[PDB]
Ligand binder design. Structure first.
Ligand SMILES: [Zn+2]
Length: 162
């Protein structure tokens, strides 16, 4: 699993994308459309770069971009966390939101909202797997592993009045 990396500047700051031939491993926030610092394969990395560029700069076409394969260890083995992440990825689209409770139910256990909240913090590929779209049943934005301001920027970017 030879790890390759590249960096992509964005409205959220420099994003570090890492992965291998088998898939995208992580999207990390290090703190005008920009190119990835290092061009070329592996394929999942190039796909992630194109996806992110579209998400930030050509959002109307986001559904057109293929989602790269994921190979971070969290996706390699079965677990409630993986079930949660995959469900979120598959169901909650651009402009949509879901409560921690609804996602828990989706994952098969309506009473596991806290575990769902914990699962969000174990998400290695934010934005792509929209942990920012998981919010409070009260209407509040809710906590975010990457900070409230970041969660609010993403939600505002998707049409929310924030
Ligand atoms: Zn890998």
């Amino acid at each position: 699993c030879e790890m390759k990396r590249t960096t992509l500047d964005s409205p959220l700051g420099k994003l570090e994308l890492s992965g291998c031939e088998q898939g995208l491993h992580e999207i990390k926030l290090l703190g005008v459309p920009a190119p990835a610092a290092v061009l070329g394969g592996p394929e999942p990395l190039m796909q992630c770069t194109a996806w992110l560029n579209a998400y930030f700069h050509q959002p109307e076409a986001i559904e057109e971009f293929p989602v790269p394969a994921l190979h971070h260890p969290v996706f390699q083995q079965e677990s409630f966390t993986r079930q949660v992440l995959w469900k979120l990825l598959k169901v909650v689209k651009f402009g949509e939101v879901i409560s921690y409770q609804q996602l828990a139910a989706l994952a098969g256990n309506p009473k596991a909202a806290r575990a769902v909240g914990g699962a969000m913090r174990g998400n290695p590929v934010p934005i792509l797997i929209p942990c920012h779209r998981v919010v409070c049943s009260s209407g509040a934005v809710g906590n975010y592993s990457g900070g409230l301001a970041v969660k609010e920027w993403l939600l505002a970017h998707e049409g929310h009045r924030l």
